[PDB]
Amino acid sequence: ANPLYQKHIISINDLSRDDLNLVLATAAKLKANPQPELLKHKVIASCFFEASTRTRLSFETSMHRLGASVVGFSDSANTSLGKKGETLADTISVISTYVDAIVMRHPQEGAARLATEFSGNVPVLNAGDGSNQHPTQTLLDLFTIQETQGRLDNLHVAMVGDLKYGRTVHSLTQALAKFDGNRFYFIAPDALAMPQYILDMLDEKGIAWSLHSSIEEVMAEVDILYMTRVQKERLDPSEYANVKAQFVLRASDLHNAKANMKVLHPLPRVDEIATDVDKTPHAWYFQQAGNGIFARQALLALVLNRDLVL
Amino acid sequence: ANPLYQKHIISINDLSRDDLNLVLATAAKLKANPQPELLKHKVIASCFFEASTRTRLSFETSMHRLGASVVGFSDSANTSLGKKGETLADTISVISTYVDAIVMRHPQEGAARLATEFSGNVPVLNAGDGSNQHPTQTLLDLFTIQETQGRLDNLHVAMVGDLKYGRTVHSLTQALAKFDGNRFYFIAPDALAMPQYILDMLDEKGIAWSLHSSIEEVMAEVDILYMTRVQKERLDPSEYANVKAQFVLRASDLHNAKANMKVLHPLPRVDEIATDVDKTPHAWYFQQAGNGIFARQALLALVLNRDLVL
Amino acid sequence: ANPLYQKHIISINDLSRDDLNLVLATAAKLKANPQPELLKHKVIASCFFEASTRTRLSFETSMHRLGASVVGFSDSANTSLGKKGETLADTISVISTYVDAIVMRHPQEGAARLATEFSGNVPVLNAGDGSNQHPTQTLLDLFTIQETQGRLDNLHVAMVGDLKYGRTVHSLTQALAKFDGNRFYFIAPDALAMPQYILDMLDEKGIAWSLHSSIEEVMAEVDILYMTRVQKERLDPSEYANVKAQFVLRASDLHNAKANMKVLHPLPRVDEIATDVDKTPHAWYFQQAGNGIFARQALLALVLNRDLVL
Amino acid sequence: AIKRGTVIDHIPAQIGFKLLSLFKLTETDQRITIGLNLPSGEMGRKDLIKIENTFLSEDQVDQLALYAPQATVNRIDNYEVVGKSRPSLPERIDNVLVCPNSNCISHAEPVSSSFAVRKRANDIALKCKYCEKEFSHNVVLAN
Amino acid sequence: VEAIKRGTVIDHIPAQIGFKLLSLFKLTETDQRITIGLNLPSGEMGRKDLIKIENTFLSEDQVDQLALYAPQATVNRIDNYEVVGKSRPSLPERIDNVLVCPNSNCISHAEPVSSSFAVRKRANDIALKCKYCEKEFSHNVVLAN
């Protein structure tokens, strides 16, 4: 079996560089040569306990592109967890008797991990758990950085906005740290800084990083400017000073950007990226979102099909 | 045609022992030898006007396993019944021009029966109508009792909790009463007792039943302990003394249980079954839920495909 | 000084037979010969944290009939306790620097007693504290019984309805038990029975009481039929079966009543007393209400004046 | 044996450890010796607590009569028991207890709890100063 | 404090830690005879705590759980009055059950699972990473049940 066959995909911290590269190689192959019947006869649960547009719809689209069927819900309000008091554990215990894999997003950190403890032999794929991890975002992110930069090592990567609550940057930083020679710039309000457990991991690996108070400081050297939304639904009321985006990127801020530089954003954006950026050649967040199909097709294929695709 | 072809499945009271046995025989066959294209080219409505996890998701999974497509809704709020004032009758009148069968759950008793009066030649399958009937629960329940006990007659069956509002036990009691020599123990608060129309039916058939105030009273003789949730969403405020489960089953209460005894629960449970029961060999409610696939596959096959499966 | 001068009036339990007789005697005198300037230059706080019609308005009317001024609030929502998080302790600490007495009703038991701990030399009069005590209701009740019956001993007294949460009957029973040879009939739902501490008190004094499931059981014996409202704002949701009046007095139930029997009710009534009772000679709940004026004037006069001469 | 201090003897099994917590007895530098589940002539099993150079406060002695009625408090100086008695039951207990009436004002407000304790074989009764409700000490011990 | 025939003696416990060990690991929830000395003279530590639990034995794992509170304690295993085994706690890989994750939005608080943390040395303190939410904390702010 391929190394990812029947594996839970919960946290980037659980995966190796080899795993990440395997997903990307598989993504490239399926994009070049679709296999519309690869997951024929699979039925996969798509269980979203908090809001989503991109992650849920690209995941479901990917299931259909591979010929799998889909059941689930886009909110918990009309599940028996929503109305009859059922625990998440019992919810997973029954759903895992129906389906071949479970894709889940949940507002509490650790929900996907918990699900793995009740899902028996049914793989759980974390579409996001509170402010913790977002591994499939990282997979499509890596695919996009690779496509646009030609490599995943020796890159200058700035991450901007809400780093404390961004499950996206937690996962992406851990992932890029598994490659060699990448350098990080963290541009965040002090209250929403990158968590210490991430910084420690960088230190331990001898990876260079620094804090910056402006985007312009680093614009001239960045290969990837990864913008983020303030996760207002996760903030303590004590942190409401930071609801408004502190860093707004406009087309004019891109004067000294390298030619190769791409602006990424896991989306949705509020105002942290002005619409005038959209037409510039550095804007790549919609392209990034479209890459979710290839990354998520690849992951489902690898988890649910024992042989490597060709 | 098989006896169930194009039939409405509304109430166990409308079915015979032969019908029930036919569903179970068909369930066994499909479990042993899946037929992934049996309902190819069917489109089936899945219409849930109140909450569900198991019934809706297992029903939809069963449709996909047989190759049918699925349309519908998991709540009524964004139907034209929910926002524009449409009657249930007109809702069924239009949906029945689209699809090959309608699966419906509804908060008012009699909704499925009413739907049959507007659905023309489109079969209606009752996924639950208020506190009335739940025939597909009974089918999977029977399948589970059969699997674990080796038979459906001459069994000692205890039913515990909210018997007044449990559509599950209304249907299951009527069903088991169609087999020979079963004996019932009803363990319920007085305010939530098994309805008289069920008791009368037992009397008329000469079936033994008795009331009990504790689980321990009968533990030593039961083959099936069928636990239920208090249906708090159906209670009159006058009945709010009974919201909390009156009978809590724990692992230690199982000391004198027969070796063959299984604990069933249509689910979701609140606290009427303690989590410590889960690891005991008598716990079978998750296995029971998984049997919903086989029962519901069988029913769709029988209703929508004219020949018996092989 | 009179025995009640500058005393807190919190619980009937703290008052003696002589204390109660003194208020009644003073009340009789003020009714016969008004003292419009008795409390001139007094300012009295009327502080109601819970709804009221009779108790607040009769209290304030009483203050005006004696020539005192009134300040306070009928709702806590626009006080600093209501909007700024202020404790009750602090509220009393400041108000007691303004006024000569504090009349207070409050939704928790003990609130009045607590007030006495922060009110310094300013007397607190309990207009009702949760389901505990209602001393001034008992004062006007006693006054009314005395007026209609000519005595406060050797009576046959029935108390009907919500006795558990009826602060009215808690105070009244304790007061009547300080007199000789009274006999009690308690007619209440099991869930709303007279609390055990009241019963124990009656036992210690060798006072006869009994439970009855019907008014008719005792109609021929009673001198005072005291009806109560189900205290729905006090019920635990488990007790909601008792929201409706279990015992409903109608004009026709009085056919065998002693001629001089009076029907009392501290009010408001819902349905426990039908309007056809109002015209019978036995109805005395509005005259009872009226007597609140003379009882409350008496209490205010005795608390705020060393001696009265009349 | 100890030279000076207190030996709390004849404590019921499974109560000794609770006492250590509640009276914060181990929050000291004084030498302490504890026996749990010791054999006892009159009790079968007992707990035993020795604290050197230390005597129970008046509060703790009062609280002891509730938690461990038939326990024995020994006062000791120069290796001798100069005082031996079961703890005197008080008629009032403040601060430590919690009124089980959830609608009691004493939960929301900055006052000390207070109960009139009434020895009442079998269960000792506790009447709340505020709500005036009375409870078995079995129920009040659910703080 | 007096010798035992059979069981475990946890010796050389730092002062103010003995009671914490009894509370945290629920050592007194048993019918076996326990003997405890608190604030005993050591001449090696100055002051020490000492816990004796009869007819009761601790695995290497259970002994390791002690490492977070008494890393230089000695656990003596006793049979027929003889010390048949001495061991020192070594830092465990994980701490399960007894602690509570300080992240209020962690799934572990709402669901029927047992708490669990990965243990590591950071800057001469102990960092605890929750199995579920993956947030990491100084062991000081991770409260017990």
Ligand SMILES: Nc1ccn([C@@H]2O[C@H](COP(=O)(O)OP(=O)(O)OP(=O)(O)O)[C@@H](O)[C@H]2O)c(=O)n1
């Ligand atoms: N210098 C001392 C003297 C006595 N004790 C303890 O104090 C308790 C009671 O002392 P004592 O009256 O001498 O023993 P008993 O006669 O058994 O008292 P009782 O009848 O109450 O059991 C015993 O546990 C004993 O160990 C002590 O620790 N130090």
Ligand SMILES: Nc1ccn([C@@H]2O[C@H](COP(=O)(O)OP(=O)(O)OP(=O)(O)O)[C@@H](O)[C@H]2O)c(=O)n1
């Ligand atoms: N039957 C026994 C044997 C030993 N002990 C206790 O076990 C501990 C260690 O035993 P031992 O090796 O004999 O003493 P030490 O040589 O001092 O050990 P260490 O150097 O580790 O302190 C001491 O607290 C001793 O009181 C005991 O309670 N009962």
Ligand SMILES: O=C(O)C[C@H](NC(=O)CP(=O)(O)O)C(=O)O
């Ligand atoms: O919400 C964000 O800002 C980033 C990230 N966004 C997404 O995954 C896109 P969506 O919520 O539409 O699926 C997330 O963590 O949910």
Ligand SMILES: O=C(O)C[C@H](NC(=O)CP(=O)(O)O)C(=O)O
């Ligand atoms: O709700 C119950 O307790 C029993 C029964 N439960 C089910 O059918 C399972 P679900 O509501 O998840 O589909 C029902 O009547 O709806």
Ligand SMILES: O=C(O)C[C@H](NC(=O)CP(=O)(O)O)C(=O)O
């Ligand atoms: O409310 C009752 O039924 C009895 C009693 N009623 C009154 O005191 C009359 P009011 O609430 O109108 O001042 C009370 O305890 O508040």
Ligand SMILES: [Zn+2]
């Ligand atoms: Zn109280």
Ligand SMILES: [Zn+2]
């Ligand atoms: Zn956590």
